[PDB]
Design an enzyme around this catalytic site. Structure first.
Site, PDB file in Angstrom:
ATOM      1  CB  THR A 267      -7.037  33.610 -52.319  1.00  0.00           C
ATOM      2  OG1 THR A 267      -7.615  33.406 -53.529  1.00  0.00           O
ATOM      3  CG2 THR A 267      -6.818  32.722 -51.553  1.00  0.00           C
ATOM      4  CG  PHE A 392      -2.071  28.695 -57.897  1.00  0.00           C
ATOM      5  CD1 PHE A 392      -3.046  29.764 -58.050  1.00  0.00           C
ATOM      6  CD2 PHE A 392      -0.886  29.548 -58.812  1.00  0.00           C
ATOM      7  CE1 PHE A 392      -3.391  30.994 -57.944  1.00  0.00           C
ATOM      8  CE2 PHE A 392      -1.061  30.586 -59.377  1.00  0.00           C
ATOM      9  CZ  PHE A 392      -2.505  31.152 -58.330  1.00  0.00           C
ATOM     10  CB  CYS A 399      -6.028  26.639 -56.631  1.00  0.00           C
ATOM     11  SG  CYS A 399      -6.570  27.869 -56.773  1.00  0.00           S
TER      12      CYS A 399
HETATM   13  C1  HEM Z   1      -3.752  34.011 -55.842  1.00  0.00           C
HETATM   14  C2  HEM Z   1      -4.786  33.049 -55.721  1.00  0.00           C
HETATM   15  C3  HEM Z   1      -5.116  32.176 -55.894  1.00  0.00           C
HETATM   16  C4  HEM Z   1      -4.220  31.036 -54.500  1.00  0.00           C
HETATM   17  C5  HEM Z   1      -3.123  31.621 -54.020  1.00  0.00           C
HETATM   18  C6  HEM Z   1      -4.927  29.954 -54.620  1.00  0.00           C
HETATM   19  C7  HEM Z   1      -4.424  28.601 -53.818  1.00  0.00           C
HETATM   20  C8  HEM Z   1      -4.877  27.634 -53.618  1.00  0.00           C
HETATM   21  C9  HEM Z   1      -4.175  26.286 -53.062  1.00  0.00           C
HETATM   22  C10 HEM Z   1      -2.504  26.726 -52.611  1.00  0.00           C
HETATM   23  C11 HEM Z   1      -4.441  25.173 -53.119  1.00  0.00           C
HETATM   24  C12 HEM Z   1      -4.255  24.015 -52.664  1.00  0.00           C
HETATM   25  C13 HEM Z   1      -4.820  23.441 -51.390  1.00  0.00           C
HETATM   26  C14 HEM Z   1      -4.785  22.175 -50.795  1.00  0.00           C
HETATM   27  O1  HEM Z   1      -4.304  21.843 -51.794  1.00  0.00           O
HETATM   28  O2  HEM Z   1      -5.106  21.825 -49.554  1.00  0.00           O
HETATM   29  C15 HEM Z   1      -5.780  25.848 -53.930  1.00  0.00           C
HETATM   30  C16 HEM Z   1      -7.262  25.570 -53.566  1.00  0.00           C
HETATM   31  C17 HEM Z   1      -8.317  25.210 -54.465  1.00  0.00           C
HETATM   32  N1  HEM Z   1      -8.652  27.236 -54.591  1.00  0.00           N
HETATM   33 FE1  HEM Z   1      -7.772  28.503 -55.135  1.00  0.00          FE
HETATM   34  N2  HEM Z   1      -6.330  29.857 -54.973  1.00  0.00           N
HETATM   35  C18 HEM Z   1      -6.450  30.869 -55.258  1.00  0.00           C
HETATM   36  C19 HEM Z   1      -7.795  32.299 -55.604  1.00  0.00           C
HETATM   37  C20 HEM Z   1      -8.624  31.109 -55.666  1.00  0.00           C
HETATM   38  C21 HEM Z   1     -10.238  31.220 -56.151  1.00  0.00           C
HETATM   39  C22 HEM Z   1     -10.005  32.449 -56.867  1.00  0.00           C
HETATM   40  C23 HEM Z   1     -11.104  30.105 -56.547  1.00  0.00           C
HETATM   41  C24 HEM Z   1     -12.618  29.959 -56.729  1.00  0.00           C
HETATM   42  C25 HEM Z   1     -12.994  31.201 -56.294  1.00  0.00           C
HETATM   43  C26 HEM Z   1     -10.008  29.002 -55.879  1.00  0.00           C
HETATM   44  C27 HEM Z   1     -10.572  27.906 -56.083  1.00  0.00           C
HETATM   45  C28 HEM Z   1      -9.592  26.401 -54.918  1.00  0.00           C
HETATM   46  C29 HEM Z   1     -10.535  25.413 -54.921  1.00  0.00           C
HETATM   47  C30 HEM Z   1     -12.387  24.994 -55.075  1.00  0.00           C
HETATM   48  C31 HEM Z   1      -9.699  24.958 -54.592  1.00  0.00           C
HETATM   49  C32 HEM Z   1      -9.871  23.159 -54.350  1.00  0.00           C
HETATM   50  C33 HEM Z   1      -9.502  22.442 -55.776  1.00  0.00           C
HETATM   51  C34 HEM Z   1      -9.860  20.522 -55.361  1.00  0.00           C
HETATM   52  O3  HEM Z   1      -9.012  20.506 -54.827  1.00  0.00           O
HETATM   53  O4  HEM Z   1     -10.733  20.291 -56.348  1.00  0.00           O
HETATM   54  N3  HEM Z   1      -9.033  29.602 -55.442  1.00  0.00           N
HETATM   55  N4  HEM Z   1      -6.048  27.062 -53.654  1.00  0.00           N
END
Ligand code: HEM
Ligand SMILES: CCCCCCCCCC(=O)N[C@H]1CCOC1=O
Length: 454
Positions: A267, A392, A399
């Protein structure tokens, strides 16, 4: 009450052959442009409704009516990411338990503790580029992925992938990339039990075993040593959920680490790559961002407080996320029978998919200039309407990594703009590769050092 539009069909296969493309998100954006704010997508055995307007997406984002759904791709990613935060249902005990334990490790305040490790890897990227010869160029998504993987290895579990020391991936990463490819390819198969897929299935099980064996060893090694480093693994070994009073078990810790490595690899590297693409295509923006980096980053090593002052670099990153949200979709289910937008009746359990690139192009919100790269749209955060900008995700299932990703990307882009001028020496034509995320494939630039020491 209206019937929703539906794209072209293939007899008994319904819409399923439209998934047979290596650029499925971009295919679905073109269908959305043709059919509008909502369309139904049918396969033998499932239906998805694709949403593109702020009007409908705002309603989908009401947590009293809709909850996070695991799309077919996330159900297959769950074969290796398990009940980690990204691939758990909100109602599973381990979702809220891990959320309560990990939220303090991902706060803006927690970034002060990760900053020095992020600087270690950012300095390795700047030194790599300072050491190129005049006749060479930079492979942008390749170097951004080296950086973001290495950052999450060091902040996640004090492990050096040493990605700037090799051209061939670590065994873990070969397996992770191949497992993500298999999971992303499974939903397009009309007959998943065809013997043509037997080798795919054997290799998938092999790749899951490689990832499980390697992360299980990391966890067992740390528990044996007693070492208390300031990484996510120490926090997960020592943390207790205030609600249940329980710590995470070692299997769930393994799934969280796998999840963080997927996110770091896929990401943040896409965001950095798209930001550099838009900067070399828009030299007035590049100049304004470079002026800020020069004025703010006055020390050889950036501080946490200086990264916070990079306002325009942050506007550049938000405008890159607007046009090419590197995680480009998320799925919801209806908690009860309901009516979407006063027009589209839904049954309990019906699945929705939010197409974030189309939300971010809704001219009823962003006005008429949506295809233009203009970071000044974000100059006053109070100007952005609620639920118009969702790179996010939404609500309690948004996220957890948002502050981590934006601190890392702001630091790195700031250092890149301080230390180099950039040339689009090929006049690169945007070509977007789709894995779990979007990245600009084949994007190359030349850097010219400003000769500012580290
Ligand atoms: C620009 C960078 C990032 C973007 C655009 C992004 C985007 C997203 C999005 C759209 C979701 C929601 C997914 C859904 O509803 O199915 C999400 C969930 C998540 N992201 Fe990211 N992400 C990024 C970076 C990261 C990083 C660096 C980490 C951890 C090291 C991370 C960890 C997670 C986790 C663990 C979830 C699930 C949260 C939950 O439902 O409790 N993300 N991300
Ligand atoms: C966090 C980034 C995830 C982005 C997911 C991109 C998925 C786009 C294609 C799509 O909607 N496929 C559906 C069809 C059935 O099963 C799926 O999953």
């Amino acid at each position: 009450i209206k019937e929703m539009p539906q794209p072209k069909t293939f007899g008994e296969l319904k819409n399923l052959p439209l998934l047979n493309t290596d650029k499925v998100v971009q295919a679905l954006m073109k269908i959305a442009d043709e059919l509008g704010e909502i369309f139904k997508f049918e396969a033998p055995g499932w239906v998805l409704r694709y949403l593109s307007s702020q009007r409908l997406i705002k309603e989908a984002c009401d947590e009293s009516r809709f909850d996070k759904n695991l799309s077919g791709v996330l159900k297959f990613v769950r074969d290796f990411a398990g009940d980690g935060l990204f691939t758990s249902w909100t109602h599973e005990k381990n979702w809220k338990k891990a959320h309560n334990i990990l939220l303090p490790s991902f706060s803006q305040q927690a970034m002060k503790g990760y900053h020095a490790m992020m600087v270690d890897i950012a300095v390795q990227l700047v030194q790599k580029w300072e050491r190129l010869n005049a006749d060479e160029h930079i492979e942008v998504p390749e170097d951004m992925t080296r950086l973001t993987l290495d950052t999450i290895g060091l902040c996640g579990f004090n492990y050096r992938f040493n990605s700037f020391y090799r051209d061939q991936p670590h065994p873990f990463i070969t397996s992770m990339v191949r497992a993500l490819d298999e999971a992303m390819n499974k939903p397009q198969r009309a007959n998943p039990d065809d013997p043509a897929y037997d080798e795919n299935k054997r290799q998938f099980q092999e790749d899951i075993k490689v990832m499980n064996d390697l992360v299980d060893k990391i966890i067992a090694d740390r528990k044996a040593s007693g070492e208390q480093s300031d990484d996510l693994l120490t926090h997960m070994l020592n943390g207790k959920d205030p609600e249940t009073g329980e710590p995470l078990d070692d299997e769930n810790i393994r799934y969280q680490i796998i999840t963080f490595l997927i996110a770091g690899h896929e990401t943040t590297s896409g965001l950095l790559s798209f930001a550099l693409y838009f900067l070399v295509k828009n030299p007035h923006v590049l100049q304004k961002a470079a002026e800020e980096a020069a004025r703010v980053l006055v020390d050889p090593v950036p501080s946490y407080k200086q990264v916070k002052q990079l306002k325009y670099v942050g506007m550049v990153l938000n405008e890159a996320l607007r046009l090419w949200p590197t995680a480009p979709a998320f799925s919801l289910y209806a908690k009860e029978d309901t009516v979407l937008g006063g027009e589209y009746p839904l049954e309990k359990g019906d699945e929705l998919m939010v197409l974030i690139p189309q939300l971010h192009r809704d001219k009823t919100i962003w006005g008429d200039d949506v295809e233009e790269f203009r970071p000044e749209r974000f100059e006053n955060p109070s100007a952005i309407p609620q639920h118009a900008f969702k790179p996010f995700g939404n609500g309690q299932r948004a996220c957890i990594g948002q502050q981590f990703a934006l601190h890392e990307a702001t630091l790195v882009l700031g250092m890149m703009l301080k230390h180099f001028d950039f040339e689009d020496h090929t006049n690169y034509e945007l070509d977007i590769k789709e894995t779990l995320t979007l990245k600009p494939e084949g994007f190359v630039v030349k850097a010219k050092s400003k000769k500012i020491p580290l």
